[PDB]
Design a binder for this molecule. Structure first.
Ligand code: ALF
Ligand SMILES: [Mg+2]
Length: 879
């Protein structure tokens, strides 16, 4: 709104004088406005990290059963629960801590030094003291400490890449603008964190700190919204159903055993039936909840971060690898990410060559030794160091890069012909040029912009020096200009300017009668491997979308090449999104597709409206502008070349720059969840039949099976080893072609439910029979023979859970070596039970035999045989 105001109006609006504050106002200004600085207010209290972990209903119920174990006197079985609750806690507390943002990237964005006028004194003070109404000067190389509008112009160009992401300097004009334009084309004002590239200017503060756009993005980063794992929402969706399911059972256990005292014959001891009820109640709650589940998921996700490590894709947060599997919207950045941020040219215009395509040759590229050198013999001012790091104006570095791409050294021709010209300074209207001296004559070098170059150039250089041709030469270079300018190519003019001879110095007046060698038009090309990663993204069912902040002209062509959008398709400006409310936003949202010239505020709002549509999205970017879109997106990717800002605010950071690894990552995420779902289907299926045997054992007043500690043992470690084995089953890559999984289906969706219930039933059937065989012989034996049959039955379950619709035979018994490796280790754990030194604390009777075990184990065996003969029901379902 202030851009419209200029000169005194901006100052009168601030009621501050232009030349000097006199330090009286800044004595005061710094009290109400504060220093130009950014400071975090994160409390990060220790209390909240742990109080917040109890929000999981799965966690509160275990706390209750652990306290009960204390009153009953089973201290052992209580303090084991507290241990795996510290696990469930410190797993969830440290995942979030890494997620938290840091202003370290924000730190040093604005240079401490700022030449400002205080009391009429030209002094340089720290950017902290800078306050609104102060006047700063910007010679070249300054860091633009305070956002603001500069009344005086030195012809200077500042780099706004930190705010916007472009690596090219943009000219700054002091003229007032009366219309609303996108933040990037605010040519009359500068913002904090931008680097001044050329010239010296004087500018107004226009507020500081949080008011600055560099501080408005800081407030945007401060929000730290969303980032909820689908699994977590999925888990809690049916954790709440579970957390209400156990409490339903605890009432019946009390009601049944209270229903058994009302009908109690003669004397009935209520204290025992109550205590008898607690032993069942605590047993059910233990048997239901999966103690290892948090610790197992945290491990399988460590395999994803390891498989992506070998493709130079770094993941900072484990649960994000599952988020990749469900992704359906990819939002990217045009420059710095989809590109190498490196320009060159394939279509040069010269009269003789007439080729759209670019041919690279070792001095044979141009007819005659003279033609190729004349395009830009001395125009460039860039420098390549021993390291070779980029340095110079970006438009000009593509020249010597062009020479190096043609296998022609630039150091061998830079010394052959030497600059002699004054180099008249470059300005908004003028174009800088240089003069050099030849073996026996002299030339003047002029490099211009075709819109202003051809107004002053009459002569034309082709097949020898040719007379100025006003007609038949302007249309063909207008046709070349326009066909170029329709492909969104930046064009510049190359002149020889041979008319002056033996001139001591260079005068600006002789800009006329120019001889022009030709024209070329360079532009930024995308990665070599993007073409494969968008055609695969489309073919994977993920709708890839673009959000960049560059000109619409450049944005139209980008995506036409890869096939993202049609040639007719038009992108939307950030000003249009400024005026479009949310009411029709989502109406437009599906077909919005590519954007153009957007602010950082604009990028993060898009991902928020895409999430409202239920589709879980992903963002890939770099620099500092992309950072809010990375933090808000359900998973944010960053480039290796990108600034440490986006690098430090992304859930994944690919160092190699190999884009294809992103679509490869979506292949891992869908497989990661395919195992987890299959794996979590295993762990609860065992938990079900264990509750079934506790409940049937309660309907006949049988002593509760498996005592108390034994139940905790099996879930914490006995079932952790096979759960990880399933977590590593084969990928089944054909499944990858199918469209992203909906974030709404249950964990058991896809027909697994009918398989989890089937397995959990056949389990309890056998455990009950062994208890009957056990209870007939003795009560002591029923506890062991039921537990024997159980922990063996859940161990053998792995062969059935390898696939809900697959059999071990014919699918490869030896297919997975870890499954067989995991089953063998559970056998040893069971072996440790039967030891005499540990038989006691495991409630296994001393008078336990091998023929009795034979009956029990044989029952546990036949259970999984039943799971394998549900093949017919599964086979019948298909037809
Ligand atoms: F190309 Al960008 F932010 F670096 F849109
Ligand atoms: Mg970028």
């Amino acid at each position: 709104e202030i851009y419209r105001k200029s000169a005194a109006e901006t100052f009168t609006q601030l009621e501050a004088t232009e030349k000097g504050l006199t330090t009286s106002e800044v004595t005061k200004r710094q009290e109400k406005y504060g220093f130009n600085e950014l400071k975090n207010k994160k409390k990060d209290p220790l209390w909240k990290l742990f109080l917040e972990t109890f929000k999981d209903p799965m966690v509160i119920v275990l706390v209750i059963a652990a306290l009960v174990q204390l009153v009953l006197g089973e201290v052992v079985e209580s303090l084991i629960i507290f241990l795996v609750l510290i696990v469930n806690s410190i797993i969830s507390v440290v995942q979030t801590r890494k997620a938290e943002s840091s202003l370290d990237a924000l730190r040093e964005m604005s240079a401490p030094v700022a030449k400002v006028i205080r009391d009429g004194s030209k002094q340089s003070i720290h950017a902290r003291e800078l306050v609104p109404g102060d006047v700063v000067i910007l010679d070249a190389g300054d860091f633009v400490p305070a956002d603001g509008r500069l009344f005086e112009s030195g012809s200077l160009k500042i780099d706004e890449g930190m705010l916007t992401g472009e690596s090219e300097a943009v000219e700054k004009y002091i003229d007032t603008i009366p219309d609303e334009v996108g933040l990037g084309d605010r040519v009359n004002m500068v913002f904090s964190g931008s680097l001044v590239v050329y010239g010296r200017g004087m500018f107004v503060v226009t507020g500081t700190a949080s008011e600055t756009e560099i501080g408005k993005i800081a407030g945007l980063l401060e929000t730290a919204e969303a980032k909820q794992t689908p699994l977590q929402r999925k888990l809690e969706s049916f954790s709440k159903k579970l957390g209400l399911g156990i409490l339903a059972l605890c009432v019946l256990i009390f009601a049944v055993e209270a229903g058994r005292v009302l009908l109690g014959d003669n004397s009935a001891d209520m204290a025992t039936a109550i205590l008898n009820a607690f032993m069942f109640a605590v047993a059910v709650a233990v048997a239901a909840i999966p103690e290892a589940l948090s610790s197992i998921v945290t491990i399988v996700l460590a395999v994803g971060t390891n498989k992506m490590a070998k493709q130079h894709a770094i993941i900072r947060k484990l649960p994000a690898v599952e988020t990749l599997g469900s992704t359906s919207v990819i939002c990217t950045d045009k420059t710095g990410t989809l590109t190498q941020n490196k320009m060159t040219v394939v279509d040069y215009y010269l009269p003789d060559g007439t080729k759209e395509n670019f041919p690279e040759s070792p001095e044979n590229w141009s007819e005659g030794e003279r033609r190729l050198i004349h395009i830009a013999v001395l125009c460039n001012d860039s420098n390549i160091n021993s390291e070779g790091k980029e340095l110079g104006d970006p438009t000009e570095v593509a020249l010597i890069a062009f020479s190096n791409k043609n296998n022609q050294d630039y150091n061998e021709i830079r010394e052959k012909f030497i600059r002699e010209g004054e180099i008249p300074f470059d300005s908004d209207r003028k174009l800088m040029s240089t003069l050099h001296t030849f073996n026996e004559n002299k030339a003047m070098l002029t490099k211009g912009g075709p819109d202003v170059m051809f107004a002053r150039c009459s002569y034309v250089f082709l097949d020898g020096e040719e007379k100025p041709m006003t007609e038949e030469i302007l249309a063909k270079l207008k046709e070349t200009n326009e066909e170029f300018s329709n492909q969104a190519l930046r064009v510049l003019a190359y002149g020889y300017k041979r008319m002056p001879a033996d001139t001591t110095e260079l005068k600006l007046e002789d800009e006329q009668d120019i001889v022009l060698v030709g024209l070329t038009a360079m532009i930024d090309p995308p990665r070599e491997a993007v073409y494969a990663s968008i055609e695969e993204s489309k073919k994977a069912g993920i709708r890839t979308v673009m959000i960049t902040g560059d000109h619409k002209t450049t944005a139209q062509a980008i995506g036409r090449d890869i096939g993202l959008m049609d040639a007719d398709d038009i992108a939307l400006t950030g000003q249009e999104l400024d005026a479009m409310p949310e009411e029709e936003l989502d109406k437009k949202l599906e077909h919005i597709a590519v954007y153009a010239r957007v602010s950082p505020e604009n990028k993060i709002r898009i991902v928020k409206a895409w999430q409202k549509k239920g589709k879980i999205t992903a963002m890939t970017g770099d620099g500092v502008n992309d950072a809010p879109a990375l933090k808000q997106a359900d998973i944010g990717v960053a480039m290796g070349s990108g600034t440490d800002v986006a690098k430090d605010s992304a859930a994944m950071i690919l160092t190699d720059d190999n884009f294809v690894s992103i679509v490869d990552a979506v292949g891992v995420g869908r497989t990661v969840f395919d195992n987890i779902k299959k794996s979590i289907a295993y762990l609860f299926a065992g938990n079900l039949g264990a509750i079934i045997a506790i409940l049937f054992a309660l309907v006949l007043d049988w002593i509760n099976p498996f005592t108390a500690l034994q139940l905790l043992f099996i879930n914490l470690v006995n079932d952790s080893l096979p759960a990880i084995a399933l977590g590593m089953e084969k990928a089944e890559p054909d499944v990858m072609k199918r469209k992203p999984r909906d974030i709404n289906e249950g964990i058991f969706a896809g027909g697994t439910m009918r398989a989890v219930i089937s397995r959990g039933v056949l389990i309890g059937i056998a455990v009950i029979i062994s208890q009957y065989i056990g209870m007939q012989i003795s009560p002591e034996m029923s506890v062991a023979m039921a537990f024997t049959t159980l922990i063996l039955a859940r161990t053998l379950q792995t062969f059935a859970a390898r696939s809900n619709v697959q059999t071990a035979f014919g699918a490869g018994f030896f297919s997975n070596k870890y499954v067989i490796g995991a089953v063998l280790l559970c056998f040893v754990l069971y072996g440790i039970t039967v030891l005499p030194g540990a038989r006691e604390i495991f409630s296994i009777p001393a008078s336990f035999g091998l023929h009795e075990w034979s009956i029990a184990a044989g029952l546990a065996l036949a259970a999984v045989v039943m799971m394998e003969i549900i093949k017919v029901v599964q086979n019948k379902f298909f037809k």
